[PDB]
From Swiss-Prot:
GO molecular function (one): peptide deformylase activity
Phenotype seen when the gene is deleted: Albino.
Localization annotation: Plastid, Chloroplast stroma; Mitochondrion
Protein EC: 3.5.1.88
Tissue specificity annotation: Expressed in leaves and flowers.
Species whose genome carries this gene: Arabidopsis thaliana
Similarity comment: Belongs to the polypeptide deformylase family.
Protein's recorded name: Peptide deformylase 1B, chloroplastic/mitochondrial
Binding-site list for Fe cation: C98, H140, H144
Length: 184
């Protein structure tokens, strides 16, 4: 259900894979388990806090994260086919970063907490409630699963604050691949 090469590599905006639409995971096997671990690896390697499969080249509904960002020094949470059952009616701001946008940080407003439904790697379902940082990392990654990027939820003003930044990635993309980016 998922073919990947190890060391995983981070996919950077404006690569199309980040918008490509993700298929649900319906095969809970060894491969799926090896993937999750490989995801935590590249996440920690790149000193990240969360990572979704689209970010490693796979268009499936898989996500991982650890508030700490350090191996064996936090809380590792992986989610398969996550569904947001409920989210807070109170909004809070936070400067978000993303591995697909090297060194770029801007303010994003999101509900402070959520209630999720998901499956684990064995395919067993589970439900949990997130708030604080875990809730914030979760929503950012859930969006990735919807082909939604964090600048999509920024205000017009905060967006202007990083327009040149995103523009530089579009050019870098063109220069590296030799292909025109689905920019703007
Ligand atoms: Zn399948
Ligand atoms: Zn590993
Ligand atoms: Zn991200
Ligand atoms: Zn410009």
């Amino acid at each position: 259900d998922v073919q990947f090469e190890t060391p995983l590599k981070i996919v950077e905006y404006p690569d199309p894979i980040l918008r490509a639409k993700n298929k649900r995971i319906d095969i809970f096997d060894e491969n799926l388990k090896n993937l999750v671990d490989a995801m935590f690896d590249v996440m920690y390697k790149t000193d990240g806090i969360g990572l979704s499969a689209p970010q490693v080249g796979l268009n499936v509904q898989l996500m991982v994260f650890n508030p700490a960002g350090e191996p064996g020094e936090g809380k590792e949470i992986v989610l398969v086919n996550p569904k947001i059952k409920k989210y807070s009616d109170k909004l809070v701001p936070f400067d978000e970063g993303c591995l697909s946008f090297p060194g770029i940080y801007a303010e994003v407003v999101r509900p402070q907490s959520v209630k999720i439904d998901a499956r684990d790697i064995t395919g067993e379902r589970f439900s949990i409630s997130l708030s604080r940082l875990p809730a914030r990392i979760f929503q950012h990654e859930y969006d990735h699963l919807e082909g939604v990027l964090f600048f999509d939820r920024m205000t017009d003003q905060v967006l202007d604050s990083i327009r040149e930044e995103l523009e530089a990635l579009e050019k870098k993309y063109e220069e590296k691949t030799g292909l025109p980016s689905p920019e703007r």
